[PDB]
Amino acid sequence: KILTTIHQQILEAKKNGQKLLAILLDPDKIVWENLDHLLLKINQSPATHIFVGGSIVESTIIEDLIAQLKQKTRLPVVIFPGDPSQISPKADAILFLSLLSGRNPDYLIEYQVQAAPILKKTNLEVISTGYILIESGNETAVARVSKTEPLNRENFDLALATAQAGEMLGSKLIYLEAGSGAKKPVPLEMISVISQNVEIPIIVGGGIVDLHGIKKAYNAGADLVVIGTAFENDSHFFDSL
Amino acid sequence: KILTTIHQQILEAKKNGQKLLAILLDPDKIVWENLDHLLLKINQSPATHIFVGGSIVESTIIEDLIAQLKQKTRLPVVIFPGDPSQISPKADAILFLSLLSGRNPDYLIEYQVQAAPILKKTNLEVISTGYILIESGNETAVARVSKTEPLNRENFDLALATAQAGEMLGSKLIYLEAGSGAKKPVPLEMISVISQNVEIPIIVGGGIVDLHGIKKAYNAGADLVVIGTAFENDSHFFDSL
Ligand SMILES: O=P(O)(O)OC[C@@H](O)CO
Ligand SMILES: O=P(O)(O)OC[C@@H](O)CO
Ligand SMILES: [Mg+2]
Ligand SMILES: [Mg+2]
Ligand SMILES: [Mg+2]
Ligand SMILES: [Mg+2]
């Protein structure tokens, strides 16, 4: 590869039609006795990025995990934060999320204002990300912790308007999120509608439990797919015959 | 001049050290019998932009005013909106405000999501603007209508963090706002702290009642100053000997 910001890496990949893949590691769900093996499987996988976050956990545990990732893998490590406490200076970048599907100001601006001076004392690449929670069948942790409601999974116009408002406000990425372990993944037609009508790259995650689901999301217009649960449940998820 | 987006015009002006000046016309405060004279004075003034907004008013009245401005002046007309109803397709651009000093989600994302599909059926240039209300002595209309509180005028660190979070989220401009007819304008040291520690251009307005106040704001780091009240009160405000 070449030395680039992660933002430029994603933009170039989208322009060149090259699909990206992030494995999400949730530090609260990591069994450390098995982490060495897990990182070997990440290295062997087609993953292009490692995302870290997805649970409220003490900062030291996140820092410990990120230190292992930076030692034992060569992938960019992007923090996927729920709270400013999850900021770790050892990561490469941070998705600076705003929960655009929600109307809880803590997750629209308050935590971001708290985070800004913290991020200024790090070398993290900060990538504004419009985070849109899509209803998926059961209540997810994102909705629980944020005390917000997801966007109706059949209201394509609202999901689009939300992504477009994000883009207009200056989001550099849209992340369409069904939630960790979602029963129903983000609808493919929603991915298509949004990817055809915004210009910025689209991340899709939540509820994707087989390779076919990844391919379908890509085909529908996802530029980067996130897999957490399926790889947490099976370190061999990406194995081939 | 040359044909440019307003955003690029502001960026180039900042790079070249050329200070900009907007006259704000509030359509609810316009006496129409005197508008022809008022527009002549705008044309003779050093204004580079006309901003329109600053009161809750029916859309037809805004459209009527903007039509006159587009006919009788040559300045770019930028909508300075309080609600998606104030969008008029006849303007050149719109400051797509988010009220970063406040924690009312209507003014952080809700109205922006409502606005997005409306803006998509116009040719308006949409410029993400981090709108920061600074305490100024009395309650202003911005605080009243938004049901938010302004930022303490002595808390430079918070004002900075707010502007930095805006910048990180993708704001293209910061607008430091004391409110229309403010008793105390935005502090000069606040303008300096923010202009030295964010890279995007800074608009300052609210409470500026003489030319000296404009010069001081510019000297402190404002890239563009907005004057409403002082010109509404005296069409000859910008006259020279
Ligand atoms: O764990 P899963 O369901 O793959 O979802 C990943 C991610 O989008 C969750 O935040
Ligand atoms: O009317 P004045 O006090 O000049 O303020 C202008 C503008 O900043 C108000 O929104
Ligand atoms: Mg998934
Ligand atoms: Mg999964
Ligand atoms: Mg003023
Ligand atoms: Mg004035």
Swiss-Prot record, chains A, B:
Gene Ontology MF annotations: imidazoleglycerol-phosphate synthase activity; magnesium ion binding; phosphoglycerol geranylgeranyltransferase activity
Record keywords: Lipid biosynthesis, Lipid metabolism, Magnesium, Metal-binding, Phospholipid biosynthesis, Phospholipid metabolism, Transferase
Alphabetical GO biological process terms: glycerophospholipid biosynthetic process
Binding site for Mg(2+): D26, S55
Top-level division of the source organism's lineage: Bacteria
Required cofactor(s): Mg(2+)
Keyword DNA repair: no
Coiled coil, from the record: none
Catalysed reaction, written as an equation: sn-glycerol 1-phosphate + (2E,6E,10E)-geranylgeranyl diphosphate = sn-3-O-(geranylgeranyl)glycerol 1-phosphate + diphosphate
GO cellular component entries: cytoplasm
Protein name as it appears in the record: Geranylgeranylglyceryl phosphate synthase
Organism: Flavobacterium johnsoniae (strain ATCC 17061 / DSM 2064 / JCM 8514 / BCRC 14874 / CCUG 350202 / NBRC 14942 / NCIMB 11054 / UW101) (Cytophaga johnsonae)
Phylogenetic placement of the source organism: Bacteria, Pseudomonadati, Bacteroidota, Flavobacteriia, Flavobacteriales
